[PDB]
Ligand binder design. Structure first.
Ligand SMILES: OC[C@H]1O[C@H](O[C@H]2[C@H](O)[C@@H](O)[C@@H](O[C@H]3[C@H](O)[C@@H](O)[C@@H](O[C@H]4[C@H](O)[C@@H](O)[C@@H](O[C@H]5[C@H](O)[C@@H](O)[C@@H](O)O[C@@H]5CO)O[C@@H]4CO)O[C@@H]3CO)O[C@@H]2CO)[C@H](O)[C@@H](O)[C@@H]1O
Ligand SMILES: OC[C@H]1O[C@H](O[C@H]2[C@H](O)[C@@H](O)[C@@H](O)O[C@@H]2CO)[C@H](O)[C@@H](O)[C@@H]1O
Lengths: 1526, 67
């Protein structure tokens, strides 16, 4: 059906963690194949790789992976296959990896670097677990019960072994771990394997003999089998070690150990003649201890030549100086240090005149000096004649060279004998190991560090034997040249075993790799898996190769490993590359009760009430996505991985901690009888069995054997005594886990709580799906530590049921037989007296233990959380899509957003946002306010967050989500969304309190994603198919477009009105601004597809025309202050954008509005019969704007006075506009007016700025004139097609000018007036006064301005003209001018409003400063430094256009021979949008800010989400889409 | 760069798509309807043996005027 997982990648190709589970591995969940399907009928899993659009990896990117393309192809570690990444600046690319067989798979990405070179990422691995079945019943990996049995203690017959099989089958173990069933070595230790390819001749005689026995275990007792596989060593008496001695490290293969060889055979030879002089041959005195140390000091150390292995032979080098003095005898460069600095001169010969391998160990005289270069230096430093003090000088230098080698020797020798008398002490003088036997040939004082033998070839070789250094990184081969452990005697050896020298591959040891390969695949044909002892000491490349050979034989190979590397990161890396399926954890390692509770806590599961993952505001919602319309397209027989909700966003693949196999006792650790007591066997195994993982035990733990069985010596056989000790309880524990294994699946599905009080340990296993759970109270018996009483156990909203209870008591000591390993007689008494009280009011269960509950006892309770059944998950994950069926792009605003000021409008100031105690209020009243807070909470499972605490303290926030929609119930689809929330929140309140936070965030997250998907479906294709960043930008359209009660765009009705920004531009007269609305109209309404909403805004604002201008402040239809010279031209530009984009957009021109003002610029009140009066067409409105400007405007603001503006002076109200008809430019404004987008009127009475504009833009502004040229071009081609009637324009005196002539006037004079030439020799043709100038190569910001220096200020306003009227700019002038803005005026998110090099530059805006500074006080800096985000949009829109025309590197051949931008340009565009994507990601408001202080500094006064901030970035994405993506 | 119909004007650099019907047996025939005399050219794009995009030369043909 659907076995697909989503693996999202970052911009650097690294996998993205969906949740924080800790250091882990991309493991895919172990699930059975579909009903009646084998390996190869279909892919086991499909990993959907998601690459971000426009990311640096997409540039000529390829996905490499060693995943075979089909089931027919075998797996190869180093054969990677190509996959092409479909590059796009809008749409992410998805690449499927079909996997047909479990194993280890990795992937890396290759791409074109920014240096046009090739670059490669890391290799990222992911493990597909094997499928474990016995006959035809699937065995979940976390329900494995493994019984480890040692071969040599099971009897001499195959049927005598099958007696042991029946015993462990009654205890209901489902897996048996075998110590290697091969022919054992001399010492008969199970791990010293004589021959790897031959089984034990005593029991088996063929491979089929063991294969039939293992298959018998499968069909008879329903038990799988696996063995140990030994890679690191082999027995010291293998006949192939004689035939092929190079398989281990010897004096030929590893020459550095020659020094350690001559020391090992110097001690076996010493211990054999030791007794002759032996003052303390075998004693236990303090004087005895020192006398053997003196014997070591004098009999071997003094007889080992002072060790020339380090020291250069002093006199034998001087002898080799006179011998050929007269050959190569000359040096050159003066870098030879003076003899005064003896240290520098001594090491200078070390770096220059030395033989290969200086410092390293090897042969006896391994460290040597190159004589021919040394004598050449001696002749250059002292004299060419030898007798001139060379014998003195050459010896002085060599002695100084050997000074560090001598101190390297004294530090080595001290560690040689300190390790000796500290090891001989414990071995002989019994501290904890009684073994003071007289030195024999079997047991000398020296442990054989090297196994000596005579081979074929003639030579007598000397291989060593592995072991373990006490402390040290296990990744360092103690036999390799990097370690000095065999020399300094820092190795605890195993004489039974012998080195296995693998190299970099099969080339260093051919026969060893071929033998181990055939040895691995032999056991792979028979058994179900392997066990690797000390896997951390086996090299990676060695373990990788052989485990892959095994998986080719047994595709369902189950790998266990005792892995204790340096850290958790190295443990995960070994699990990643080797394909380990389970890690061994030992419960006997816990020294105290608290360490056991912490060990059990690590492998028990997740906390109770843990948050569930949901796609939120960080996912793409493709409008064309498949949907489980009622979460019903699932069949239990398909065994498909489920999506999170009705939306079919597949299950995310995230790193999870590697699976654990918890062993209550292995075959190497001491018995509970030894480390603790025998009674602890019951509570220890119960705590382990309750963990949500695989469990196991060694044979004898359940049968309470007295002490740890010596794997080397002991020959006794396991007892056939049945049903001893815990055998009854393990049958219960394993049978109970079989009931749980049927439904428990992933990591979020099993929860846990563990408590430790004194000697008691509490375990509460809970299934998060149905609410069924187990409660374990286990009193541990580490020591007999007196009576302890456990307090009253309290379970909230839960009912408990007694299951079973036992006590383990000791009845004397164990028998002492020489034939049979018999355990300690124990009584298993069932317990009673447990009182389970249930309060029928508070629904609280209390549990009291009886006083007869001795240490070493347990009691298991079956428990069930109240309010949860099996049908709870389906009821929450269904119906939300049908509930959002009737939602509109307007109605989604009330479900998801609504600021507190917007909510006060509908609620008259009564409601607002829910206040979270000890935190604050969410940013929006809708679901977005919750999602913005919950995403970080769900990611970290922060159950201690103030919101998490409040959710389980009561149902206030639960009812708040449902009760909000009463304000907007009458709107389209909101009622059905509220009913889905009402029914689901009602069902949630019936749950336990501690489970409400996880379920509250799940219901809110599901409805949010359905509302966000519904939005992408209602929008256009370019938005509903793009990256999260583009869709997040598009959701700002829903944040701003809303219906209100205190304001609107129409004076007679209350309809949808685009707000300027939230929350400070949303209510009353502060909401609608004509300048802002039509700058954002193309991005928020046209790019998104809200064509009808864009028409309503154009028509409504057209009604409020006056003075041939559009009002800055639109109060619906009453008092619309006309303080704007900028607004009317952005308005007429939005009309062109409407007609250009909307199909049949020319119909807007003939739309009849009811112009609420007379043609003559007068003043009619709201209630006036002359308000409706006449009708106006958009054709007429556009012409009225063009001709009124040309004909000369003349007006003073109506109702001027303190009532209008409390700061504007009287002369400021009379602002005017006229067209200079020699240039075509539209000038206008005064130094007392602020009629541009930089609208800041001073209001500081302490700085004396009241009424003084901070940025008065009087004269010709680049924005106004650029929009004028675009409007003229639009109406010219409009008449050429027959859509515009008017073609004449009258000038103030009375003459007529054709509209074409006005367009030609600007075309011929715009660049001449504004452009500042970069060379001073061209200043004579561009109307420039060079005395007042800042930088050259700049398009001016103003023309004929009141302040002449403000004319030449570098401001981002010229880019608006570059976007709307590119014909006014010669390409090379515009490209160089906009490159200056990129280096100087471009901030990280916002565009610097003023050149930082200017003297008026104050980039910090703090409206509320009461100082005497003419700028900082009362926020006059508004547009004099601060970085605005919308100007960034117009900047990059023209940065892309003019770099595409100028720079030849920004162009590449396209289909149909249309010039398309290069990846070099897309790379530069993508980089300049990273800060915007980070901003909208990590902001509580799901948008982009209005303003930013200097260099990205957050401005508190800035509105956190602004309409035209995100709308101008959507303009760029639509530009690249509508022009190239065809 | 042949216009699709007589209403569409001629552009030197605006080329139009035509799909080649691949077959191992049958050749494909693609018609180029010309409505006005002038200079017309055609080139072919295809998937290279390197799985890349490759283009042939521009091949011109002249339709003489009617006098
Ligand atoms: O209903 C009648 C109406 O009459 C009066 O309205 C006028 C104001 O008195 C008058 O000052 C003016 O308001 C203008 C202002 O002159 C102009 O410079 C501009 O102001 C900036 C602010 O300087 C700036 O700080 C910022 O204000 C934000 C602030 O940063 C933010 O942190 C938060 O506090 O919200 C503030 C806005 O509420 O941005 C603005 C806007 O760019 O624009 C102002 C609005 O046009 O002209 C008004 C014309 O009606 C009375 O004063 C008013 O109370 C009456 O309701
Ligand atoms: O010239 C006054 C005008 O420009 C200043 O900028 C430059 C100036 O253009 C240079 O000639 C020289 O004087 O360095 C000045 C910067 O220190 C001021 O920045 C500007 O505010 C002023 O109006």
């Amino acid at each position: 059906a659907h076995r697909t997982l989503l693996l999202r990648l970052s911009d650097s190709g690294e996998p993205v963690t969906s949740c924080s589970y800790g250091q882990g591995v991309l493991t895919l969940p172990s699930l059975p194949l579909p009903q009646g399907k084998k390996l190869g009928d279909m892919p086991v899993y499909t990993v959907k790789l998601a690459i971000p659009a426009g990311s640096p990896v997409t540039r000529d990117g390829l996905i490499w992976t060693n995943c075979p393309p089909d089931f027919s192809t075998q797996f190869d570690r180093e054969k990677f296959y190509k996959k092409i990444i479909k590059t796009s600046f809008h749409e992410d690319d998805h690449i499927d990896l079909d996997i047909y067989v479990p194993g280890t798979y990795c992937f890396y990405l290759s791409f074109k670097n920014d240096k046009d070179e090739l670059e490669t990422t890391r290799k990222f691995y992911f493990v597909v677990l094997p499928i474990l079945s016995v006959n035809d019943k699937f065995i979940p990996l976390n329900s494995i019960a493994m019984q480890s049995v040692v071969s040599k203690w099971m009897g001499p017959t195959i049927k005598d072994w099958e007696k042991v099989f029946a015993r462990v089958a009654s205890k209901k173990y489902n897996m048996i771990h075998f110590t290697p069933l091969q022919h054992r070595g001399e010492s008969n230790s199970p791990y010293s394997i004589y021959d790897q390819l031959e089984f034990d001749p005593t029991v088996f005689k063929s491979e089929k003999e063991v294969a039939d026995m293992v298959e018998r275990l499968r069909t008879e007792h329903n038990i799988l089998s696996l063995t140990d596989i030994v890679f690191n060593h082999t027995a010291n008496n293998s006949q192939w070690l004689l035939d092929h001695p190079e398989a281990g490290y010897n004096h030929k293969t590893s020459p550095h150990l020659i020094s350690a060889i001559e020391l090992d055979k110097k001690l076996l030879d010493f211990s054999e003649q030791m007794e002759a002089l032996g003052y303390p041959v075998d004693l236990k005195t303090v004087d005895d201890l020192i006398k053997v140390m003196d014997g070591i000091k004098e009999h071997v150390i003094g007889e080992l030549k002072l060790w020339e292995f380090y020291v250069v032979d002093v006199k034998q080098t001087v002898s080799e100086l006179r011998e050929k003095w007269g050959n190569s005898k000359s040096w050159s460069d003066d870098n030879i240090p003076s003899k005064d600095d003896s240290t520098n001169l001594a090491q200078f010969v070390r770096d220059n005149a030395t033989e290969p391998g200086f410092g390293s160990l090897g042969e006896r005289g391994s460290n040597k000096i190159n004589i021919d270069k040394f004598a050449a230096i001696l002749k250059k430093l002292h004299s060419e004649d030898y007798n001139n003090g060379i014998e003195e000088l050459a010896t002085k230098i060599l002695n100084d060279i050997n000074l560090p080698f001598y101190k390297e020797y004294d530090d080595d020798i001290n560690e040689v004998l300190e390790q000796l008398f500290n090891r001989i002490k414990y071995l002989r003088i019994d501290d904890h190991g009684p073994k003071q036997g007289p030195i024999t040939k079997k047991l000398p004082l020296s442990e054989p560090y090297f196994t000596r033998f005579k081979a074929k070839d003639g030579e007598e070789y000397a291989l060593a034997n592995n072991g373990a250094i006490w402390d040290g990184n296990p990744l360092v081969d103690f036999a390799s040249s990097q370690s000095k452990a065999y020399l300094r005697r820092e190795v605890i050896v195993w004489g039974d075993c012998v080195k296995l020298r693998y190299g970099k591959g099969p080339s260093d040891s051919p026969y060893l790799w071929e033998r181990m390969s055939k040895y691995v695949e032999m056991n792979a044909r028979i058994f179900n898996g392997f066990r690797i002892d000390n896997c951390h000491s086996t090299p990676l490349h060695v373990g990788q190769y052989f485990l892959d050979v095994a998986r080719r034989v047994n595709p369902n190979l189950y790998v266990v490993a005792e892995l204790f590397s340096g850290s958790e990161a190295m443990d995960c890396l070994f699990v990643e590359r080797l394909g380990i399926s389970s890690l061994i954890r030992e419960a006997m390692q816990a020294w105290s009760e608290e360490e056991l509770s912490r060990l059990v806590h690590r492998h028990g599961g997740r906390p109770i009430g843990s948050y569930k993952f949901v796609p939120l505001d960080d996912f793409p919602y493709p409008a064309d996505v498949k949907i489980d319309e009622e979460y019903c397209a699932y069949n239990p027989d398909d065994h498909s991985v489920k999506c999170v909700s009705e939306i079919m966003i597949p299950k995310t693949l995230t790193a999870t901690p590697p699976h654990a196999l918890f062993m209550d006792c292995t075959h190497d650790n001491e018995t509970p009888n030894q480390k603790r007591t025998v009674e602890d066997t019951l509570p220890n195994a119960a705590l382990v069995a309750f963990c949500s993982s695989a469990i196991g035990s060694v044979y004898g733990y359940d049968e309470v054997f007295p002490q740890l069985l010596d794997l080397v010596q002991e020959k006794r056989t396991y007892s056939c005594a049945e049903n001893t000790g815990i055998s009854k309880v393990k049958t219960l524990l394993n049978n109970m886990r079989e009931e749980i294994a049927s439904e428990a699946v992933d990591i979020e599905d099993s929860e846990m709580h563990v408590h430790h009080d004194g000697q008691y340990i509490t375990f509460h296993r809970t299934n998060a799906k149905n609410g069924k759970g187990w409660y374990l109270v286990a009193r541990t018996k580490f020591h007999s530590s007196g009576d302890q009483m456990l307090p009253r156990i309290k379970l909230s909203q839960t009912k408990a049921t007694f299951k079973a209870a036992f006590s383990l008591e000791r009845t004397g000591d164990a028998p002492i037989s020489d034939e049979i390993i018999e355990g300690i007689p124990t009584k298993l008494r069932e317990l009673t007296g447990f009182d389970i009280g249930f309060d029928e009011n508070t629904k609280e269960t209390s549990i009291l233990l009886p006083q007869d509950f001795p240490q070493g006892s347990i009691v298991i309770f079956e428990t069930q959380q109240l309010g949860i059944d099996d049908s709870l998950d389906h009821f929450i994950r269904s119906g939300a899509i049908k509930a959002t069926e009737k939602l509109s792009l307007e109605s989604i605003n009330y479900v998801l957003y609504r600021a507190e000021q917007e909510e006060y409008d509908y609620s008259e100031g009564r409601s607002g946002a829910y206040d979270i105690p000890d935190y604050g209020k969410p940013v929006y009243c809708g679901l977005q306010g919750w999602v913005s807070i919950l995403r970080k909470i769900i990611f970290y499972n922060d159950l201690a967050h103030p919101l998490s605490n409040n959710l389980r303290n009561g149902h206030w926030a639960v009812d708040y989500v449902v009760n909000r929609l009463d304000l907007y119930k009458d709107k389209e689809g909101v009622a059905e969304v509220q009913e889905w929330l009402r029914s689901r929140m009602e069902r949630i309140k019936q749950l336990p309190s501690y489970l409400v936070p996880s379920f509250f965030a799940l219901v809110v997250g599901i409805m949010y994603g359905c509302c966000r998907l519904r939005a992408m479906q209602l929008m256009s294709d370019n938005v509903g198919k793009s990256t999260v960043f583009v869709q997040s930008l598009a959701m700002t359209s829903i944040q701003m477009v809303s219906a209100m009660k205190s304001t609107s765009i129409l004076p007679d009705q209350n309809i949808a009105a685009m707000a300027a920004g939230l929350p400070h531009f949303s209510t009353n007269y502060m909401r609608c601004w004509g300048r802002d609305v039509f700058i954002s109209l193309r991005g928020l309404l046209l790019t998104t597809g809200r064509y009808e909403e864009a028409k309503e805004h154009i028509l409504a604002f057209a009604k409020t025309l006056k003075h041939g201008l559009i009002p800055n402040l639109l109060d619906a239809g009453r008092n619309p202050r006309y303080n704007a010279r900028d607004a009317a031209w952005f308005f007429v530009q939005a009309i062109q954008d409407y007609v250009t984009i909307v199909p049949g957009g020319v119909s807007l021109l003939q739309e009849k509005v009811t112009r609420r003002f007379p043609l003559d610029d007068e003043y009619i009140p709201y209630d006036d019969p002359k308000a409706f009066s006449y009708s106006s067409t958009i054709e007429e409105i556009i012409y009225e704007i063009l001709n009124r400007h040309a004909g000369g405007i003349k007006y003073r603001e109506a109702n001027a006075g303190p009532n209008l503006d409390r700061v504007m002076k009287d002369e400021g109200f009379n602002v005017e506009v006229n067209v200079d008809w020699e240039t075509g430019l539209i000038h206008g404004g005064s130094q007392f007016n602020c009629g541009t987008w930089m609208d800041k009127m001073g209001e500081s009475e302490k700085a004396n700025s009241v009424g003084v504009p901070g940025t008065p833009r009087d004269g010709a502004a680049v924005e106004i004139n650029g929009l004028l040229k675009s409007c003229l071009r639009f109406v010219l081609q409009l008449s050429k097609d027959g859509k515009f009637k008017y073609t004449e324009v009258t000038k103030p005196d009375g003459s007529k000018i054709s509209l074409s002539s006005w367009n030609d006037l600007l075309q011929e004079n715009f660049e001449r007036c504004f452009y500042v030439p970069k060379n001073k020799e061209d200043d004579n043709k561009f109307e420039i006064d060079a005395t007042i100038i800042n930088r050259r190569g700049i398009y001016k910001d103003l023309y004929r301005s009141g302040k002449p220096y403000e004319d030449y200020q570098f401001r981002p306003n010229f880019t608006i003209a570059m976007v709307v009227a590119p014909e006014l700019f010669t390409p090379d002038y515009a490209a160089g001018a906009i490159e200056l803005a990129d280096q100087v005026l471009r901030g990280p998110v916002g565009m610097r409003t003023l050149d930082p090099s200017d003297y008026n530059y104050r980039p910090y805006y703090n409206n509320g400063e009461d100082s005497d500074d003419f700028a900082t006080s009362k926020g006059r800096n508004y547009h004099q430094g601060p970085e605005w985000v919308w100007c960034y949009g117009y900047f990059i829109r023209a940065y892309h256009y003019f770099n595409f025309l100028t720079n030849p590197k920004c162009q590449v051949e396209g289909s149909a021979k249309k010039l398309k931008p290069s990846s070099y340009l897309y790379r530069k565009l993508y980089s300049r949008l990273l800060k915007h994507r980070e901003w909208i990601e990590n902001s509580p408001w799901a948008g982009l800010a209005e303003l930013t202080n200097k260099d990205g500094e957050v401005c508190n006064d800035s509105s956190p989400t602004q309409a035209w901030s995100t709308g101008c970035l959507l303009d760029l994405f639509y530009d690249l889409w509508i022009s190239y993506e065809e």
